[PDB]
Amino acid sequence: GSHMLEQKKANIYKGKITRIEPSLEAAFVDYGAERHGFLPLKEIAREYFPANYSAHGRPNIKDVLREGQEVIVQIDKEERGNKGAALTTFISLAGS
């Protein structure tokens, strides 16, 4: 599939949302990751809440991401027992 190494960066991952808690405004992503990739809502790209959807400010993850939706993400913050596999959005996301 579309996962040949990466593009001059950290290893980019493409997996789906598996956990989204409106209580914490962030999503866990399951890409063979034993810690799951955790993407906070304030990072979320327009790719998540479709480019056809009106976006003016900051998205709301509870109605932006849904389990079964894939993302293109790499780990900006490493697992250290406290933060986990933290997903960035400094990637070619938001197809708008």
UniProtKB/Swiss-Prot annotation:
Residues 28-83 are annotated as: Interaction with RNA. Disruption phenotype: Essential, it cannot be deleted. In a temperature sensitive mutant at non-permissive temperature, slow processing of the 17S rRNA precursor to 16S rRNA; a double rne-rng mutated strain no longer processes the 17S rRNA precursor. It comes from the Bacteria. Residues 10-90 form the S1 motif domain. Changing residue 38 to A: Reduces RNA cleavage by over 98%. It is found in: Cytoplasm; Cell inner membrane. The N-terminal S1 motif binds RNA, and can also bind single-stranded DNA (in vitro). The C-terminal region interacts with the other degradosomal components. Endoribonuclease that plays a central role in RNA processing and decay. Required for the maturation of 5S and 16S rRNAs and the majority of tRNAs. Also involved in the degradation of most mRNAs. Can also process other RNA species, such as RNAI, a molecule that controls the replication of ColE1 plasmid, and the cell division inhibitor DicF-RNA. It initiates the decay of RNAs by cutting them internally near their 5'-end. It is able to remove poly(A) tails by an endonucleolytic process. Belongs to the RNase E/G family. RNase E subfamily. In K12 strains that are derived from W1485 (including MG1655 and W3110) the rph gene has a frameshift that leads to loss of its ribonuclease PH activity. In strain K12 / MG1655(Seq)* the wild-type Rph protein has been restored. Component of the RNA degradosome, which is a multiprotein complex involved in RNA processing and mRNA degradation. Within the RNA degradosome, RNase E assembles into a homotetramer formed by a dimer of dimers. Tetramerization is essential for catalytic activity, but not for RNA-binding. Interacts with RhlB, PNPase (pnp) and enolase (eno). Interacts with DeaD at reduced temperature. This is Ribonuclease E. It comes from Escherichia coli (strain K12). The chain holds residues 35 to 125 of 1061 of the full protein.
